[PDB]
Design a protein around this nucleic acid. Structure first.
Ligand SMILES: [Mg+2]
Ligand SMILES: [Mg+2]
Ligand SMILES: [Mg+2]
Ligand SMILES: [Mg+2]
Ligand SMILES: [Mg+2]
Ligand SMILES: [Mg+2]
Ligand SMILES: [Mg+2]
Ligand SMILES: [Mg+2]
Ligand SMILES: [Mg+2]
Ligand SMILES: [Mg+2]
Ligand SMILES: [Mg+2]
Ligand SMILES: [Mg+2]
Ligand SMILES: [Mg+2]
Ligand SMILES: [Mg+2]
Ligand SMILES: [Mg+2]
Ligand SMILES: [Mg+2]
Ligand SMILES: [Mg+2]
Ligand SMILES: [Mg+2]
Ligand SMILES: [Mg+2]
Ligand SMILES: [Mg+2]
Ligand SMILES: [Mg+2]
Ligand SMILES: [Mg+2]
Ligand SMILES: [Mg+2]
Ligand SMILES: [Mg+2]
Ligand SMILES: [Mg+2]
Ligand SMILES: [Mg+2]
Ligand SMILES: [Mg+2]
Ligand SMILES: [Mg+2]
Ligand SMILES: [Mg+2]
Ligand SMILES: [Mg+2]
Lengths: 175, 56, 159
RNA sequence: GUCUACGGCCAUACCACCCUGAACGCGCCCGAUCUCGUCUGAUCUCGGAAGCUAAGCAGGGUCGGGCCUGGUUAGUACUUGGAUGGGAGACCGCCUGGGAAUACCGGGUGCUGUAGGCUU
RNA sequence: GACGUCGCUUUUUGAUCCUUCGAUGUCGGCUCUUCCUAUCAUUGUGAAGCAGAAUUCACCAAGCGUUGGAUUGUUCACCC
RNA sequence: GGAGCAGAAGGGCAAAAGCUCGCUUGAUCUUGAUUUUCAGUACGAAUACAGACCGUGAAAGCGGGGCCUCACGAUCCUUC
RNA sequence: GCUCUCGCAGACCCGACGCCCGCCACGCAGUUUUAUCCGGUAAAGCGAAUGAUUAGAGGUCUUGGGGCCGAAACGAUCUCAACCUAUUCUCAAACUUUAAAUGGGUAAGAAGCCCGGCUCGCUGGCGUGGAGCCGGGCGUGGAAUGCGAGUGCCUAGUGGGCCACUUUUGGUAAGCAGAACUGGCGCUGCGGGAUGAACCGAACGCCGGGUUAAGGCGCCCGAUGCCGACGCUCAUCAGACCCCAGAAAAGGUGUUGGUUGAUAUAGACAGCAGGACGGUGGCCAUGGAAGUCGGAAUCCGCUAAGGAGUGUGUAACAACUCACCUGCCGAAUCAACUAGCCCUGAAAAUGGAUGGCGCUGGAGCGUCGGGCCCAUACCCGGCCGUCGCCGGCAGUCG
């Protein structure tokens, strides 16, 4: 499974109706995927690990993108995940600040790849929820929990280093 | 929930070349009439056709 | 390396199943075989007379000749790059019939009666069989209740 | 509802122990003249019918042992095909499909063919 | 540093048979240059069961030096 | 069946294929077909039949060697 | 070569013009599907057989040893045994109840179906059974997908192979030796892997345009000269991309993330400090305690909290006075694991190799985006030839 920016889907599925149980139960997952094809694939993966159910003897009765409920309010997100290193597998709890749930999960994927060299096929996201400010554990979010927060932008590195490529004056980094 | 009908028509495209191909894959691709690269066609989807797509 | 003996490598295939030794049941002797029908070749090992070769074990042929205790069978054998029809004399403890051809014959008779009834009643009915079509759009009732939320489990090391 | 004779599948039918068996039957049983066999009429063969269900046999039982069939084990183990996946390797993860077997927990415990009997 | 266990090296000997059989002169010494470091000495150090003297264990380090003979064709060896 | 079935091992086998008696010589005379190795050549080994003459058993049957998988040999010449 | 098959379409014309509806060839296949058999590998099992193998527990018999006071009925019943029973630890290429995935065979109709009749020296209770033969009627051509087939003669070269994924035998291993399966190289150029028979992409007539694959885009060198995204990492041997061309066990208070536990306003942790100790050293041991000692030990202290000390190198009364708190200090701290990058572990011979230069707000590592670059691959077009249509033209019929 590759990436991009992720979307959250809810995928609801069931086993196929045999003439023993004419109404098999429905199951629902929240799945963070680049698109709905990857969403259905990851659904069948997870539900096959959990229940004895395969894509052949089953169906997707619904696969639909969950939109962000409040995409203009900055939320804290707690991610409960498991992954596996080159050695055995580990449980983990991360915290992020974002506007969207899928944005925070994408942030978690790039962060796990950065800090633990973990690939997306190694990561399994098992819980994601919206944390308030007073329930957070990580200092990288609790330092932004301040109502009168204030900081400068100290060392502004020039970015247009090629427009111009040859100038006569050296750039300034204080602004 | 409304589960729509799983489709009866597929468009298939051969997207790999002809070098170093298994004989069973070769036979299935030429039964699909995909003898060149980027060489698509229409198939009708049932169990037999879906299983030979799963082969190739 | 290895020998060209006639029963080389037949330690398990010419043996009996577990708790199935001893006397051969008599229905296997009182089956009948007319020349032309399809038989499976297995080759039990309680009887050592007329037993087929290990290349013919697990095969299927048709009867061309009936004798007192055995049957001449025409079987396809694949020598290196050709398939050729071998004629083997095998005994009735080593053969049994073929339910595939039996099923085909009963659907032939069903087709014939169906075409007769369609012709007399003045309709057109389907006679061929079609390979498992797609799945015919339908509604799935939730019966009021919400579908249960599934969720991957944490990792714990037991074993 | 059963039984004899001959069976078919060959333990759901076996094994261990306990209870019940009306009527026909099947036996146990009585005997050695003949037939025929023995060291021995115990076995086999023959000739019977005083007694008997004690036994065989049948049916039932046992938180029975086995066996049969499900669940669980477990979408686990293993595996088809794929990758310029990971890892120094050993091996491991994923994608696409298939998918077991113990331990443990249920339920069951002979069906049936042909011919001939008994059961008011 | 016992029982164990992880390595490196190609100055030992094997294992292999890829190159060479219309030929790559086959042991040792002599001579002469250069390289390496897994440092014997010397320079600068740290440690000691380093009081001194002597020695031992490490580190940076290959700049510089590492001999004369008896016996043996000897490489090795052994002695003065 | 944990024994035995001539021997190596594997398979098979219980009123058997084992053990003990009784009677015998199907370990005989013949033509073809087939399988095994295979080039679908031969030998060897084997499997179904068919035609004689027999053995055994009350009989159905079984038997042309050894319960099955090994135990063997062209042309030319000699001999019967 | 041959035997067939599809059929050519009606001058230019124009799917058709026969009999409500309906039908659109046969066979074949390195393929699936539907049925139906076959198998003993992977796995699993050993409270299932055969072998192998670890440990306790419970019982009553015996050529168990014996067991102390029983010679005297070992008055005895115990210690140990064997043995039995129910469990338990771990195994099998030449074990196995069970048992896959992938796989092997067969079938999926006109050579079929169903009616009559006849022949037989085989078979026989029978008009039997079986086989053969002569007539007759039934086409919805009886799964999917693809495809033109069959058939004969003559025949060269080859019979040293090698490599790769997976499986696998011998070997410590090998660019070693030997197999299975598929693909390649040989016999094959081209784009990429700097370089390379075999890797990755893709197979090639001669060209123009477009676009791609694998691979890339600081400069060599086409393309990021994006105001690219988020992090990680400093190396006095950094790192830098399939095969592949170089490293492990073990460590790090280097930094980053995580898991679990613990302490703290009845005031943590670290520092400023007071009593911070006693009969009893009871016991231990006088080669060692009226503190601090190899042994078994371990209490009450007359206490805001104190030992049979972890503090004061001891036979020593040595004896300074830490352990435990209350007054300051007033809010977080500590520990054990874990895995990312970096470091140590880490030594070879001419001077040298992420390809080089160099690169550290990356030109490094991980997860990603939008652009862009170009192969003999793909698309469109041109031209050459080959093959096929057994294609068209004898109607020069103003
Ligand atoms: Mg390729
Ligand atoms: Mg061999
Ligand atoms: Mg052998
Ligand atoms: Mg025989
Ligand atoms: Mg039971
Ligand atoms: Mg799967
Ligand atoms: Mg050599
Ligand atoms: Mg070689
Ligand atoms: Mg030479
Ligand atoms: Mg030369
Ligand atoms: Mg020369
Ligand atoms: Mg020279
Ligand atoms: Mg050094
Ligand atoms: Mg100098
Ligand atoms: Mg006779
Ligand atoms: Mg005869
Ligand atoms: Mg085998
Ligand atoms: Mg195994
Ligand atoms: Mg065992
Ligand atoms: Mg040669
Ligand atoms: Mg090799
Ligand atoms: Mg050559
Ligand atoms: Mg070729
Ligand atoms: Mg090539
Ligand atoms: Mg190249
Ligand atoms: Mg390279
Ligand atoms: Mg071009
Ligand atoms: Mg480049
Ligand atoms: Mg450029
Ligand atoms: Mg390093």
């Amino acid at each position: 499974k590759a990436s991009g920016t992720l979307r959250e889907y809810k995928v609801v599925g069931r086993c196929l109706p045999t003439p023993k149980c004419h109404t098999p139960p429905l199951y629902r997952m929240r799945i963070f995927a680049p698109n709905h094809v990857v969403a259905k694939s990851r659904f069948w993966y997870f539900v096959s690990q959990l229940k004895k159910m395969k894509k052949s003897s089953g169906e997707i009765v619904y696969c639909g993108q969950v939109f962000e409920k409040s995409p203009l309010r900055v939320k804290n997100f707690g991610i409960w995940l498991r992954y596996d290193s080159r050695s055995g597998t580990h449980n983990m709890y991360r915290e992020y600040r974002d506007l969207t749930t899928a944005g925070a999960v994408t942030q978690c994927y790039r962060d796990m790849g950065a800090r633990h060299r973990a690939r997306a096929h190694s990561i399994q996201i098992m819980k994601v929820e919206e944390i308030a400010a007073s329930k957070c554990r990580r200092p990288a979010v609790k330092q932004f929990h301040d109502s009168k927060i204030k900081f400068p932008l100290p060392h502004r590195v020039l970015r247009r280093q090629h427009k111009p490529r040859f100038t006569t004056k050296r750039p300034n980094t204080f602004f | 929930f409304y589960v729509p009908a799983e489709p009866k028509l597929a468009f298939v495209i051969r997207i790999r070349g002809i070098n170093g191909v298994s004989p069973k894959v070769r036979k299935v691709l030429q039964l699909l009439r995909l003898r060149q690269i980027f060489n698509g066609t229409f198939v009708k989807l049932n169990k037999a056709s879906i299983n030979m797509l799963r082969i190739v | 390396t290895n020998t060209k003996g006639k029963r080389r490598g037949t330690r398990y295939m010419f043996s009996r199943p577990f708790r199935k030794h001893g006397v051969v049941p008599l229905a296997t002797y009182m089956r009948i075989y007319k020349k032309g029908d399809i038989v499976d070749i297995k080759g039990m090992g309680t009887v050592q007379k007329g037993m087929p070769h290990k290349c013919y074990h697990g095969k299927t042929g048709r009867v061309y000749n009936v004798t007192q205790h055995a049957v001449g069978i025409v079987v396809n054998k694949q020598v290196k790059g050709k398939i050729l029809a071998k004629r083997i004399n095998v005994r009735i403890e080593h053969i049994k019939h073929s339910k595939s051809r039996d099923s085909f014959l009963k659907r032939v008779k069903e087709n014939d009666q169906k075409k007769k009834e369609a012709k007399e009643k003045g309709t057109w009915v389907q006679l061929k069989r079609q390979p498992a079509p797609p799945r015919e759009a339908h509604f799935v009732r939730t019966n009021g209740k919400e579908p249960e939320l599934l969720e991957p489990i944490p990792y714990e090391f037991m074993a």
